[PDB]
């Protein structure tokens, strides 16, 4: 109709104005600023610990608050809490649904969140007076597969599902208090700011949206990718974040300057990225490509400074300790390796 | 463990026993026959599920000392390419189609029919990169409604390039051959086609024979004799 056409034209000219305003402040590039920093030496990482015991297919891992424990999820309905120092299995939790895609570890070391492809997210209490691990609360209400789940506080949680929706839950009540909508494609990843005040999410339509926890609705949108979004994570500072997609390209974004900082891609790699993580200083970036090995990048110069080629299958999950003593890499063939 | 303290050997023992528990539990998951069921919803998926039986729906049933685990994923209503790789090692695929829906037209578009949707979805599933060596069984249900619909209304509407006797047998043979024509491998993947009405006595036997053949082939390939 005439109203629809005029409103579409108005939306297009707002988009043009936004693009012009964004391009107006594009005066310099990060590479030019950081072209004087001396480059880091060859980062040689060796497998200090090899964690085995999964007889099935691994999907997700998460490091602990004390940088000693971690949790992993496999396809045989197993959630294993390990001990990275002495290579011991602290806990083994059966899962009602064997189709798990993500897992979350509480920052207080008291709860663990598991869910995926079942529209239900379960919370298990690690510190139980009975001495075992049992389900505490089940969150339901989504109409799509849950892709990521992370803990805000000891009582708050945020989950993104396959029905293009994010939801903020309360374990005490079990009902949603905030719903985040606006994505046309399915949501695949989310990340939280260090201050637990804002969080970003990525969608299959090559778009990332920033959402505010307090107000509960989106602030900013970033585009530029050409395929599905796979992984996302903030910079340790908390004013920037990096996103890795399926089109064999990673990008670095910014919160104040709404432009592109750097792009990480190589000619010899024609396959996308599955997991992206940072280090303590933000100088080192870890990108787990699906070409049977991981990669290490210089975040300030977009240069490769190490290859973690030690896996015989595709790479799915990757994590970094809180104090950055060592890194951990899971894989698609039921093996975990701690590199240092 | 000479260096291990009094409270460190117990942790090692606990880890070893958890290893034993998981090793014991992982041997009971390889003795199940996994079937993944697919269709168009209105093609007769629910009636087939109710017939062969005594997010995602999981069903378990036993027949002739064999355990079958059926996965129905028609209620997901999401992107297929983002989670299909989870079903990489399914033992067999079951596909459901109603051949009496050739005259029926989809509600979204009156021009498009359900038969073409079924054919294109079968084409998409058959040529997947994760199902290069996966056996597929094809079920054509509600043949009665098709046979009484083939007389009042000819099938030339669905197939304008068809020239036959306008009988049930010729139309069924043409549809069955067209459905088999969607194969592009013909070496490691075989399609089994069956016809059944609401009342049935042999579908379970058909799927049992198919899975038995698949198991025999897998066992032959495992030892390297194949």
């Amino acid at each position, epitope marked *: 109709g005439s109203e629809l056409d005029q409103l579409r034209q108005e939306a297009e000219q707002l988009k043009n104005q936004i693009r012009d305003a964004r391009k107006a402040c594009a005066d310099a590039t990060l590479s030019q600023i950081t072209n004087n920093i001396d480059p880091v030496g060859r980062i040689q990482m060796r497998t200090r610990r090899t964690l085995r015991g999964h007889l099935a297919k691994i999907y997700a891992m998460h490091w602990g608050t004390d940088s*000693r*424990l971690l949790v992993s999820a496999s396809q045989d309905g197993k959630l294993i809490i390990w*001990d990275s*120092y002495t290579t*011991n299995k*602290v*806990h083994a939790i059966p899962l009602r649904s064997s189709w798990v895609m993500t897992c979350a570890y509480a920052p207080s*070391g008291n709860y663990v969140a598991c869910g995926g492809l079942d529209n239900i997210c379960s919370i298990y209490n690690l510190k139980t*007076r*009975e*001495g*075992n691990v049992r389900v505490s609360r089940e969150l339901a209400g989504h109409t799509g597969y849950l892709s990521c789940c992370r803990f805000l506080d000891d009582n708050q949680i945020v989950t993104s599902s396959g029905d293009t929706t994010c939801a903020l839950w309360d374990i005490e009540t079990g009902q949603q208090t905030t719903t985040f909508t606006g994505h046309t494609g399915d949501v695949m990843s989310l990340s939280l700011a260090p201050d637990t005040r804002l969080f970003v999410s990525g969608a299959c339509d090559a778009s990332a949206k920033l959402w505010d926890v307090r107000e509960g609705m989106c602030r900013q949108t970033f585009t530029g990718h050409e395929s599905d979004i796979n992984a996302i994570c903030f910079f340790p500072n908390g004013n920037a974040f990096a996103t890795g997609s399926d089109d064999a390209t990673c990008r670095l974004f910014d919160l104040r300057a709404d432009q592109e900082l750097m792009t990480y891609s190589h000619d010899n790699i024609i396959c996308g990225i599955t997991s992206v993580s940072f280090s303590k200083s933000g100088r080192l970036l870890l990108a787990g490509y699906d070409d049977f090995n991981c990669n290490v990048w210089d975040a300030l110069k977009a240069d490769r400074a190490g290859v973690l080629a030690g896996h015989d299958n595709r790479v799915s999950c990757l994590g970094v300790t809180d104090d950055g003593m060592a890194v951990a890499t899971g894989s698609w063939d039921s093996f975990l390796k701690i590199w240092n | 463990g000479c*260096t291990l*303290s*009094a*409270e*460190d*050997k*117990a*942790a090692v*023992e*606990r880890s070893k*026993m958890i290893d034993r528990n998981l090793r014991e539990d992982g041997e009971k998951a390889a003795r199940e026959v996994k079937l993944l069921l697919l269709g168009a919803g209105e093609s007769g998926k629910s009636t087939i599920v109710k017939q062969m039986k005594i997010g995602i729906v999981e069903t378990h049933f036993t027949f002739k000392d064999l355990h079958f685990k059926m996965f129905d994923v028609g209620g997901q209503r999401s992107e297929r390419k983002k989670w299909i790789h989870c079903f990489e090692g399914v033992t067999a695929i079951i596909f459901c189609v109603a051949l009496s829906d050739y005259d029926l037209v989809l509600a979204e578009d009156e021009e498009m029919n359900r038969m073409h949707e079924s054919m294109k979805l079968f084409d998409s599933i058959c040529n997947n990169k994760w199902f290069t060596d996966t056996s597929i069984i094809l079920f054509l249900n509600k043949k009665d409604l098709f046979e009484e619909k083939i007389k009042k209304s000819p099938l030339t509407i669905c197939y304008p390039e068809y020239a036959g006797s306008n009988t049930y047998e010729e139309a069924a043979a043409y549809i069955q051959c067209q459905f088999e024509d969607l194969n592009k491998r013909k070496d490691t993947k075989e399609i089994y086609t069956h016809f059944t009405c609401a009342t049935d006595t042999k579908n379970v036997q058909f799927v049992f024979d198919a899975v038995t053949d698949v198991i025999i082939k897998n066992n032959l390939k495992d030892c390297g004799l194949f």
Partner: single-chain antibody
Amino acid sequence: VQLVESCSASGFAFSSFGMHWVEWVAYISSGSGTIYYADTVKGRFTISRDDPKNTLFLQMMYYCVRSIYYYGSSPFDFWGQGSDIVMTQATSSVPVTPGESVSISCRSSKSLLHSNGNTYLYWFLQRPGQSPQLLIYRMSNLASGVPDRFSGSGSGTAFTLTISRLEAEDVGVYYCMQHLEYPLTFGAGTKLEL
């Protein structure tokens, strides 16, 4: 969770917990893989486990205590109802009025700091007419379900248990127990008289 004393389990998984007896008598881990006996009575008493009935038998005051061994664990959490390194405590009785700090000292003869950093000292309190309750495990962490007032600190061969604020419910008998190596040795009984 509760233990009714042989003994009986009700409200928890008995098959995932190690068991001790408190002097120490015997120790049996999960699955009975490792079983340790006391040097003084080895030969006349025997320990056996029955997981299906959740009952631990002792063929022959005696106490049976739970434990579990992993990182961040709190062994000797529940005490039920009821060569060798020597532990000594000089203090035997100290009158005190509620509202003032109290210090109790426990000595050793060697270095209790193992290479893993764990100082295996367990301070526990026994109320008059009540079963003992764990107060401090590993000499640095407080137990659960107990008041926050108690604390402890120490180094080398000297350790101390401190009470910052004292009330009328602190009357009892305090014990420091070592777990560095088997057999487990107990210190001299330190009684506090009101």
